[PDB]
Amino acid sequence: SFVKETVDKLLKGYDIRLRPDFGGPPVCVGMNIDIASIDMVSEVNMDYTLTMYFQQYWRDKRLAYSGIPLNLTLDNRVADQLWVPDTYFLNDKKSFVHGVTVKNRMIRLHPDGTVLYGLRITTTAACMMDLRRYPLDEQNCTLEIESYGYTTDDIEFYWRGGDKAVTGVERIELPQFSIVEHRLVSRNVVFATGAYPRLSLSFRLKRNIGYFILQTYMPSILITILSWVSFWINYDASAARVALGITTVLTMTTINTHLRETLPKIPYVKAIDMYLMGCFVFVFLALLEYAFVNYIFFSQPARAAAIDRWSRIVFPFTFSLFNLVYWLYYV
Amino acid sequence: QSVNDPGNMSFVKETVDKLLKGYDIRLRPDFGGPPVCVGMNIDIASIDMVSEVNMDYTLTMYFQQYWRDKRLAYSGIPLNLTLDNRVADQLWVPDTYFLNDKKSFVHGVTVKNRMIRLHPDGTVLYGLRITTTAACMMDLRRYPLDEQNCTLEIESYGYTTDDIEFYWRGGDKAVTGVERIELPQFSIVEHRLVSRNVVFATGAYPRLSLSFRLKRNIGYFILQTYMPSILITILSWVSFWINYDASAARVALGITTVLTMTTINTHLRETLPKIPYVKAIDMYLMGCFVFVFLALLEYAFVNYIFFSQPARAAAIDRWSRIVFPFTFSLFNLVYWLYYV
Amino acid sequence: SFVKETVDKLLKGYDIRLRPDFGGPPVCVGMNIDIASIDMVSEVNMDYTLTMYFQQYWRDKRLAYSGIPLNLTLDNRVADQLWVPDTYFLNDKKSFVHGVTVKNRMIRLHPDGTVLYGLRITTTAACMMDLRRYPLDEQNCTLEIESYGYTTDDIEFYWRGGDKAVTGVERIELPQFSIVEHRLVSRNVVFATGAYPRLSLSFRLKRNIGYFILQTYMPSILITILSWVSFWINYDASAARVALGITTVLTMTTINTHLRETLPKIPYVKAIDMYLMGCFVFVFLALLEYAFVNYIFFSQPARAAAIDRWSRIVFPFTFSLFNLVYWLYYV
Amino acid sequence: SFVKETVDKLLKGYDIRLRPDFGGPPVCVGMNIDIASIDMVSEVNMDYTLTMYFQQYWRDKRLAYSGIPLNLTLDNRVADQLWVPDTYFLNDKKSFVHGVTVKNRMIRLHPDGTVLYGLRITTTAACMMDLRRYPLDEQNCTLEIESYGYTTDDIEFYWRGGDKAVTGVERIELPQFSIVEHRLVSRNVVFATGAYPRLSLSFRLKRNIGYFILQTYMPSILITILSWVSFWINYDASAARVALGITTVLTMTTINTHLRETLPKIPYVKAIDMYLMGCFVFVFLALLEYAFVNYIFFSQPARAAAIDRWSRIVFPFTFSLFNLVYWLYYV
Amino acid sequence: SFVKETVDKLLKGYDIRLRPDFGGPPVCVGMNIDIASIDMVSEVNMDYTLTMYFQQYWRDKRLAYSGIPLNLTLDNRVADQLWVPDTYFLNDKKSFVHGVTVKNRMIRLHPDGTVLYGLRITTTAACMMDLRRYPLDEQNCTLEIESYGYTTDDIEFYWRGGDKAVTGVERIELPQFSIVEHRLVSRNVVFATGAYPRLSLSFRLKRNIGYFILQTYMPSILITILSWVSFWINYDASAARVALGITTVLTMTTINTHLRETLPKIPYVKAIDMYLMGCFVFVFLALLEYAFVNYIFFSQPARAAAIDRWSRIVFPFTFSLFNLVYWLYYVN
Ligand SMILES: *[C@@H]1O[C@H](CO)[C@@H](O[C@@H]2O[C@H](CO)[C@@H](O[C@@H]3O[C@H](CO)[C@@H](O)[C@H](O)[C@@H]3O)[C@H](O)[C@H]2NC(C)=O)[C@H](O)[C@H]1NC(C)=O
Ligand SMILES: *[C@@H]1O[C@H](CO)[C@@H](O[C@@H]2O[C@H](CO)[C@@H](O[C@@H]3O[C@H](CO)[C@@H](O)[C@H](O)[C@@H]3O)[C@H](O)[C@H]2NC(C)=O)[C@H](O)[C@H]1NC(C)=O
Ligand SMILES: *[C@@H]1O[C@H](CO)[C@@H](O[C@@H]2O[C@H](CO)[C@@H](O[C@@H]3O[C@H](CO)[C@@H](O)[C@H](O)[C@@H]3O)[C@H](O)[C@H]2NC(C)=O)[C@H](O)[C@H]1NC(C)=O
Ligand SMILES: *[C@@H]1O[C@H](CO)[C@@H](O[C@@H]2O[C@H](CO)[C@@H](O[C@@H]3O[C@H](CO)[C@@H](O)[C@H](O)[C@@H]3O)[C@H](O)[C@H]2NC(C)=O)[C@H](O)[C@H]1NC(C)=O
Ligand SMILES: *[C@@H]1O[C@H](CO)[C@@H](O[C@@H]2O[C@H](CO)[C@@H](O[C@@H]3O[C@H](CO)[C@@H](O)[C@H](O)[C@@H]3O)[C@H](O)[C@H]2NC(C)=O)[C@H](O)[C@H]1NC(C)=O
Ligand SMILES: *[C@@H]1O[C@H](CO)[C@@H](O)[C@H](O)[C@H]1NC(C)=O
Ligand SMILES: *[C@@H]1O[C@H](CO)[C@@H](O)[C@H](O)[C@H]1NC(C)=O
Ligand SMILES: *[C@@H]1O[C@H](CO)[C@@H](O)[C@H](O)[C@H]1NC(C)=O
Ligand SMILES: *[C@@H]1O[C@H](CO)[C@@H](O)[C@H](O)[C@H]1NC(C)=O
Ligand SMILES: *[C@@H]1O[C@H](CO)[C@@H](O)[C@H](O)[C@H]1NC(C)=O
Ligand SMILES: *[C@@H]1O[C@H](CO)[C@@H](O)[C@H](O)[C@H]1NC(C)=O
Ligand SMILES: [Cl-]
Ligand SMILES: [Cl-]
Ligand SMILES: [Cl-]
Ligand SMILES: [Cl-]
Numbered sequence A, C, D: 001s002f003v004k005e006t007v008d009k010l011l012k013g014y015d016i017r018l019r020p021d022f023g024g025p026p027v028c029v030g031m032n033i034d035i036a037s038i039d040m041v042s043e044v045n046m047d048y049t050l051t052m053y054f055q056q057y058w059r060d061k062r063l064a065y066s067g068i069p070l071n072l073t074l075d076n077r078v079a080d081q082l083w084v085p086d087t088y089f090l091n092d093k094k095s096f097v098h099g100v101t102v103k104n105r106m107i108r109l110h111p112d113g114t115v116l117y118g119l120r121i122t123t124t125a126a127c128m129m130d131l132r133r134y135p136l137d138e139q140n141c142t143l144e145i146e147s148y149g150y151t152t153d154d155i156e157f158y159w160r161g162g163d164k165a166v167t168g169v170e171r172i173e174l175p176q177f178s179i180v181e182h183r184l185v186s187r188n189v190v191f192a193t194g195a196y197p198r199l200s201l202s203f204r205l206k207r208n209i210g211y212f213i214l215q216t217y218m219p220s221i222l223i224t225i226l227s228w229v230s231f232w233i234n235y236d237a238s239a240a241r242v243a244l245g246i247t248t249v250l251t252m253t254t255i256n257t258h259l260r261e262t263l264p265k266i267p268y269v270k271a272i273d274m275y276l277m278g279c280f281v282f283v284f285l286a287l288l289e290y291a292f293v294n295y296i297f298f299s300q301p302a303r304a305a306a307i308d309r310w311s312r313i314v315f316p317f318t319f320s321l322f323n324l325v326y327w328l329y330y331v
Numbered sequence B: 001q002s003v004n005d006p007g008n009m010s011f012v013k014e015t016v017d018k019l020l021k022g023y024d025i026r027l028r029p030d031f032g033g034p035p036v037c038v039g040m041n042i043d044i045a046s047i048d049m050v051s052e053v054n055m056d057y058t059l060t061m062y063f064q065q066y067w068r069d070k071r072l073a074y075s076g077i078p079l080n081l082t083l084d085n086r087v088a089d090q091l092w093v094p095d096t097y098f099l100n101d102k103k104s105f106v107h108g109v110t111v112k113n114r115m116i117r118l119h120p121d122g123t124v125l126y127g128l129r130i131t132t133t134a135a136c137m138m139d140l141r142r143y144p145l146d147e148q149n150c151t152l153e154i155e156s157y158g159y160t161t162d163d164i165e166f167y168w169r170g171g172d173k174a175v176t177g178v179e180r181i182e183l184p185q186f187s188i189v190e191h192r193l194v195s196r197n198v199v200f201a202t203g204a205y206p207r208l209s210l211s212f213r214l215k216r217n218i219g220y221f222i223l224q225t226y227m228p229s230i231l232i233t234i235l236s237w238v239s240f241w242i243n244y245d246a247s248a249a250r251v252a253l254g255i256t257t258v259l260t261m262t263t264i265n266t267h268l269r270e271t272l273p274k275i276p277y278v279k280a281i282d283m284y285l286m287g288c289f290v291f292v293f294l295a296l297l298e299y300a301f302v303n304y305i306f307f308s309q310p311a312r313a314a315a316i317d318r319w320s321r322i323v324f325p326f327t328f329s330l331f332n333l334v335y336w337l338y339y340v
Numbered sequence E: 001s002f003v004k005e006t007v008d009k010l011l012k013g014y015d016i017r018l019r020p021d022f023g024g025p026p027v028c029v030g031m032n033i034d035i036a037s038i039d040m041v042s043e044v045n046m047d048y049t050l051t052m053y054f055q056q057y058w059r060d061k062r063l064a065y066s067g068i069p070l071n072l073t074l075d076n077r078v079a080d081q082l083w084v085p086d087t088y089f090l091n092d093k094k095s096f097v098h099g100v101t102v103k104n105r106m107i108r109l110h111p112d113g114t115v116l117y118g119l120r121i122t123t124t125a126a127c128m129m130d131l132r133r134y135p136l137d138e139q140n141c142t143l144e145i146e147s148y149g150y151t152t153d154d155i156e157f158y159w160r161g162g163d164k165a166v167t168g169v170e171r172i173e174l175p176q177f178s179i180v181e182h183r184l185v186s187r188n189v190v191f192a193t194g195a196y197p198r199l200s201l202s203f204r205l206k207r208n209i210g211y212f213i214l215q216t217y218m219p220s221i222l223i224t225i226l227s228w229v230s231f232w233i234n235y236d237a238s239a240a241r242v243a244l245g246i247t248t249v250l251t252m253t254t255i256n257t258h259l260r261e262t263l264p265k266i267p268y269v270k271a272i273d274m275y276l277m278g279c280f281v282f283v284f285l286a287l288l289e290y291a292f293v294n295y296i297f298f299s300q301p302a303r304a305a306a307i308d309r310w311s312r313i314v315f316p317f318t319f320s321l322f323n324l325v326y327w328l329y330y331v332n
């Protein structure tokens, strides 16, 4: 019965409008993040979705209790009757606190007056990407934490636990990406309305080439290899050799144009676009070679036979040399 | 009156009224003492969907929680009180949440699909109808001859093992409706209930765990990918029976079967999430590519030699007619035995 | 002024927590449905969307009024101050009450104490479908109405108007389906927590073949006729006759694989698949016929000429016979 | 200070449950709509989206004020404390009142006690369409406005401004459609629960052929012209002439099947399907013509040469005649 | 302590229904926008999405305080207890105030009685587009700010900071577009219910040709170059030369029809559409040339040989001339 009256004494005459230490020193909010998952990474909408346990820790002397030598875990609905920091994710596209079975919210009071406030949030944050080196690229995605209305005079942010404040980054299971590094940053960003406290979480994503080797690289190598079958077919076979030319020239064009439609409409040329343009030149030259052989074999059969003979070794050699130059330059 | 008229609505009203007078929702039952024991019960209405692309699944269920709140015990009435669901907003309830939940919701037509039943001893029966999209990370190395394990992780959001304790009410028979699941592409092979106490920085937390073992039905894949592969490979063999004078015809069969094979593999890969490994089906489709590419190389070779060596060329076409179907049957036999 | 003091005295001391006749006989709720539309029927998500006027009728003696000889239509917000049945659709996926300009909700009180409670709901209900006979199939879709918390001891459901309780089923405008029949059912489903009242609405949907004749059947018949043009072309024409073979054999494969992707991933074989597999055998045999003629015309020109001669009559005859057997068996 | 106390005493003892003139003559609500836009028209989901300023006007004597000779514009939140008509859109699929920065809501009181109530609503309304004449079709789309719970005994609806009640129909910017006409209708629809007031807004949409000429009509003409190139190619060219025949026949079937997938699964034949079927017969006959010429040129070279000579004039002539008959019949 | 009580007297007997200076001169609301991002630009739904910090400044004498010589930042929930302008975006399709961890809302009181009210809004606004010059086109997209219920007699709007009221336009990272200019406008739009205050923010977007050069222009140039290979192939090669004709003619048709499906169903013809119609004519004429050569080479082999050797120079020349005329006309 003592503990019942105590909680009621705390909130008696409590004004939510006023932050703790209202006219005095700034309230120091300690942030802690446990990353549950990186649900998705989109190049098309140049963003990523993250689910986390967002924990905030500050003192409110108005909530201090003398009698009880225990930490009080109160039903989450009490958060609607308390002052809480106006923390927001500056680079947020859409966010939400999970609400089944209850609001995924936690309030834990300490006799000191300190509050532990937990929220389970799913956030889709913006991540502008440079796809020049795609698919052999690294992306830096961040989560920008800030106060919406309170300046550095009223509110101060800090990572509670220092470099060990954010957890669960190593248990992230992204199939196409691998978290290579993550960094915590504390700043005070100056604006027209004053200086604001800022926390910053950043991770560096490294793309896994596997999918691209199987989807784009192997189909391009095979189309180029299929273009070389023509040099072993009799030059009398005009339809067969032109059919091989047309087929491999168009299939390359569609491999390049298709891949471009799977990504956002960027105006620059990607690493994979350089490879495919190379492959186009090699399959277009095989067809020009037949056109040239077809144009000369009547008057110069020996020369025509020779051009097909040389094409059989020059083309595979030059393509191996192109792959060697390309893959060494990018790695 | 030690026993009161159950039909006296005025006595029930004033009884329920004194129960909630001075009741603090902030405080859990037995606030400073032993933990409150919540008994969980799930009746699975359906497994609405299973997505490989977003590596998740969706289930609809009747989620029931059971606990005793002595503050809600009543002496007069010899009946269990079914109160209008809106009373749940005036009572303390466990902060139960699904740890691996992506999106969830309680159904709200015609009213919130929730139920409160009070018992004279103070026990509360609390029901909710939830739809949950939960994460299910999948290993598609053996796809489409694979099995997946999908779970539902139940936990307390703010209360530690010192304040709340979870248990499956009914033991192994706590979760029902699993046998009534109608999934067209999957079959529930087994399900397991688990009770734990997961340790974290903020303390030990009670955890209940529901698990399924989903087995994929090969039927769709046989008709969509396997039979079209077998037919394109059979198509590539028609070339060996066509006169080697027919350069366009035989190269057209080669090109057609070689490209169709490439598109069967690349298409299937786009229907799934961008995984970097090679699936069971990819091994089969790569095999079929090698068989359809060799038939074209065989014509290239025959075309290259039939002027100077017509007998040899005729023989290579003669042998290809038996070697190719034999080796493909042997490949099918090795693949299907290895994977089953 | 009298009618104003009347409504106030009705809700004074009213306990919303308690159902009418709280400790006595069950309250009898009379359900009535006007179907505004069957907005959609999905095979892919095996469900259907329906919009309706859902009306419930029950008597609450606490709401009886003596003076007024009129039925009182009160502003819908009064429903938040009254007890209402906890009616829910057991097989719904998502549902909602329309909210513009106000909640599409209606409360009509009767001097008796009877309440008429109306709601305009859009419901996406589950409808598991058997597509073995697709597209010559009939589907049975239902709407399962139940009490969420009250057992048969507290609530009883009934169709108000009997067989004429559900209206607007005959004015349903589905382009691909036709409502052939609908049935109303009353039950008491037994569960662990007790017996529950259940009302059940069912429809029998009949698919319209029209779309399929134009999209799948006619393209199959034409691709099969196209394959017969080969038998009239000179056997010297190896490319032409193999081109017709390849073209018709692949087009057949894509007609079947495409249709399968438009539907959910079922493991069985549909009615349309038996027709399309038939067409595949007919187009594959036309190509084997050319292969056979191409294989023999040097040594046996007369026989080759004869095989082409017979193919011209046997193939159209056997295909007509296949169509006749298929359609008679399925109708 | 006098105006401050006037508004407070306005709502003193006011019951929102009770409509104005509760036991007497019906309240006359005057509706008036300014259409901001017709955001979209979908054939697939057979509906259209519309954004508008929905204004309602009625007199509530409980809200009359004596002292002030001005019209009072009160903060929109006051609408939650007043009785408002239960107006709803009968053929509505989904609707919403815009909520940024505030609810797009307006309350203007008049000394008389008259209320001007404004709402900015986006509505997706159903529009069942007849696509038999598509894309030379005209569709009639309506907005059905009704009272949800109040009968003609309690509420009466009317268009405030008569034929000039709905504005902004002439400034509608639909790229594929043109508003040809619009009509306002006032009725009293009889139902089981009584007679209800109904306002009806109807507009007649006319489709713009431009897109279809470029997307379907021109590619069909060009594929049919491509089919005629065959008659000028030597009949010795079996592969070339069969390749033109296969190509034109198949691309024609894909033009028809593709267009059908862009629209809802209707079982009937559209105006554009009649044209495309005609085109198919013309491309299929060009191929049969080659089959016939290929079948006879050995024994009858003169006849074969003649059939190709005639095909060069008969086919373009008959196609021009088909276009003339088609376009005249449909316009 | 004293500050707790001063705010409580401020709101005692305060009527939210009544705007500041009710019945007197119209309240002057000073608008300020900090553009966080232009998230997307859609031609299909002819709209654009924008996220911003929307700030409003007005004076409410009812909220003046004497004791405290400080500006009071109150918990955002106090906005529900104050009068606020009924500001709305006239050309808005869907909008929302961000709500994690709290409503991204800010109230800052000044001893004077002025109020600083901030909101972080994501707005999908309509932008009707003229695609006649697509993809070498400029689009003007606007954000129309208005009062929903209050006339110019009760509310007046103004850009707080003049030409420097809207910030962050230069920091916009659009991959396919570049903000070339932006303009602020103040008006008083007259309607049936009276004159209304209107602020207007306008952007001029310039499309980056890069993507289109790689996706549509280069594949067209490559397909017409492919069509020219036919003139170097022996006229005896009927299948080969007809295969090149059919292939290039159909690929050209799909490049044009595909692009049309990526955009909204407009009835006019775009700048690419006329380039792509030109390429079709070049590519169809190469096939007619073979048909003509195939039709005459028996009786006139010399003439046929000549038509192929002229086609080899006339076609590439004429196509360069088409590109010169088209690209000069469209740069004007
Ligand atoms: C991802 O990108 C961001 C932004 O480009 C990187 O953030 C930057 O991180 C460094 C710390 O690693 C910060 O620099 C520090 O500045 C202080 C004060 O000048 C100095 O004393 C330190 O020695 C250090 O240089 C920097 O402020 C910060 N930039 C911003 C604006 O956030 C981030 O590190 C990258 N993360 C990963 C994992 O790649
Ligand atoms: C699906 O996967 C999960 C996780 O891999 C499986 O859960 C595991 O289930 C077993 C019981 O079958 C638990 O092990 C038990 O541990 C106790 C205490 O050490 C021991 O006394 C028992 O003999 C038994 O080994 C295990 O804790 C649990 N793992 C977790 C973390 O949940 C689940 O069984 C799989 N379900 C299906 C149907 O395949
Ligand atoms: C759609 O499918 C449902 C479920 O398969 C059909 O519902 C069934 O309807 C019949 C009435 O037509 C019910 O049977 C009756 O049972 C009573 C009591 O045993 C008996 O006296 C009657 O003679 C009759 O047999 C049956 O209970 C009911 N099943 C369930 C579980 O709902 C429905 O009729 C089908 N509707 C259409 C329109 O095809
Ligand atoms: C769009 O379609 C609707 C429904 O088919 C048309 O509505 C009809 O409009 C006319 C007035 O133009 C109404 O008819 C009138 O009835 C009275 C009483 O019988 C008679 O005195 C008049 O001479 C006239 O015939 C009719 O009630 C109404 N139908 C309904 C049920 O709404 C509408 O006109 C079409 N709109 C456009 C712009 O094409
Ligand atoms: C985007 O398009 C809009 C609308 O077409 C352009 O808005 C127009 O902007 C000018 C100012 O640049 C306004 O004109 C001014 O009118 C006053 C009064 O007549 C005059 O004193 C000034 O000298 C000036 O001419 C005009 O009212 C305004 N139109 C509307 C209705 O908003 C806008 O400038 C374009 N923005 C960009 C960045 O391209
Ligand atoms: C209360 O919580 C704090 C962490 O802030 C810790 O130091 C202490 O051990 C806890 N005390 C009790 C009573 O368990
Ligand atoms: C019903 O209960 C009330 C107590 O609230 C009491 O006044 C009354 O005596 C009881 N029964 C009757 C109808 O006498
Ligand atoms: C009340 O509920 C319990 C189940 O918890 C059961 O034992 C008992 O039979 C019920 N009693 C009544 C009064 O029906
Ligand atoms: C009141 O409603 C009932 C239907 O439940 C009907 O019998 C009666 O006619 C109505 N009475 C009045 C006053 O209109
Ligand atoms: C008040 O509004 C009415 C329109 O209903 C109009 O007749 C009148 O002029 C307005 N009066 C004032 C005081 O402006
Ligand atoms: C209060 O805010 C204003 C900006 O409106 C500024 O001029 C002034 O410096 C601030 N005063 C204090 C007390 O910091
Ligand atoms: Cl959620
Ligand atoms: Cl729902
Ligand atoms: Cl709605
Ligand atoms: Cl909105």
Ligand SMILES: [Cl-]
Residues within 6 Å of the ligand: A093, A094, A095, A096, E097, E098, E099, E100
């Ligand atoms: Cl948000």
